[PDB]
Amino acid sequence: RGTKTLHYLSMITVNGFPGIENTEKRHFEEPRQPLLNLEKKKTAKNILDEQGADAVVDYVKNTKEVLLTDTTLRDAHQSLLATRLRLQDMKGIAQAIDQGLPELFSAEMWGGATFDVAYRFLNESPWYRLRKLRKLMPNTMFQMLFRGSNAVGYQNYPDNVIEEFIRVAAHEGIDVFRIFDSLNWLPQMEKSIQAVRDNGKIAEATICYTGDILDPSRPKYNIQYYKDLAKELEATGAHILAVKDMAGLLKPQAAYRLISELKDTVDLPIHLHTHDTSGNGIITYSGATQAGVDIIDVATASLAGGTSQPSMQSIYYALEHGPRHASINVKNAEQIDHYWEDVRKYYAPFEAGITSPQTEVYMHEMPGGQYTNLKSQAAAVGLGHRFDEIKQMYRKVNMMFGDIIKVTPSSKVVGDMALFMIQNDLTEEDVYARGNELNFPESVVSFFRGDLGQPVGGFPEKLQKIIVKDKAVITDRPGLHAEKVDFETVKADLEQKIGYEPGDHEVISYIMYPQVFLDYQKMQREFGAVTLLDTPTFLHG
Ligand SMILES: O=C([O-])CC(=O)C(=O)O
Ligand SMILES: [Mn+2]
């Protein structure tokens, strides 16, 4: 692999890394290796391996402390580093995390945007990352973010593709599947929940939080809605109930109220996921801890705060002498955090910039990722000045869309509309009047055609016809209409294309990212395993 490696090194030395400025290669010291005090603690991963998922949920229930999930490997750098954290950097500290923090309920290391980004921009396989980390991290439960009826892709897939993906992901190491739907619609969740149960893994059924349950002017997503959705989620056999707060909208008094009402509505342990965008993540988690939440999502201090999760280290001290403590070795966590502080410096080209708590997110409930994508695709098309009012436009088109849940990929729908109207000086009242000739963004017509599922309360019918002029509108699961996929023929059609017989993970990767996977194969032909280079060499030559 010498010739491939020198070819890549020459390419980056001379033409720079695509998508970032050709900064000169900097001198970096070796990241600090942690000094750890180690104990053998019989992690939840061991319980799952030995006695199944029901044993794990019994363990979670009988834990007095609040358990932690480390999001450093997925959501922290999705929020902060544009999902660019490389496997080479993970593997330098994976064993330290696994051995030094056995108290961790799980590490969220897969799913979300990482699957697409690894292939597309890092030229490393997500499956390879999962395999290497699983070998390095044998005692920590691995958690993935699963998007309901579309596993890690965007388009809806037939059910067999989803089930085969779940089986392969569970065979290759994933233990906990946080399954969610972009509109909190059960029919998109239940099949994949069943598949996770059948593969012997833990199913986390997720309710996306939106709006404000303690504000009576927004009764659509009131607390009763959350309780009913929770009851029905518990009716599907999900092992855990997660409460995804993708935008950090959950506020401390609502979190305590919400968790407590869910707590006496269902019997599943509750997993709380919040983002620190508003600066209230720690107090929200503390409020949920009082209500009796079981697991909370945190990130290491160096990749925490801002649009990421609240700090793993700070939440410990926030609870140190209260009735409920955090289950973590905080001294070991502080040592591991030194490694992450240092390797973050390699990812300077991907940093967002000066970050301070922003409560504007309470008004524009756009998640952090959707926030950067609107920074990256408003100014780039000449509207960076107006970004502070397209945020207001984002607020408006959500209300005209019927006040929908804004998480991937439904948050891309709202942003596409709002950016489109500002791009054409369209107010709300003209799209109802001059809307019969406008060409709405593809993501908007597809959403109003039912391709993302059915939102709560349906569509604003009059507005829907204005959008989907002469197109079929479906009202059932989009996957029910999905074109059938036969894996054996996909294996044949792929083997002829990549030059070798693919494993079962490469087949599903090809199915859910056809062009991306094949573009990754081309680059592996040209450059080979660029995943083995260190980040400064990978990025700057
Ligand atoms: O916060 C969101 O929009 C959900 C998320 O992490 C993903 O699905 O990649
Ligand atoms: Mn998140």
Residue numbers in the entry: 460 to 1000
Text lifted from the article:
Pyruvate carboxylase (PC) is a tetrameric enzyme that contains two active sites per subunit that catalyze two consecutive reactions. A mobile domain with an attached prosthetic biotin links both reactions, an initial biotin carboxylation and the subsequent carboxyl transfer to pyruvate substrate to produce oxaloacetate. PC is mostly found as tetramers of four identical subunits, with monomers of ~120–130 kDa in size. This enzyme possesses a tetrahedral geometry with the tetramer organized in two layers. In this work, we study the structure of Lactococcus lactis PC (LlPC) during catalysis in the presence of positive allosteric regulator acetyl-CoA.
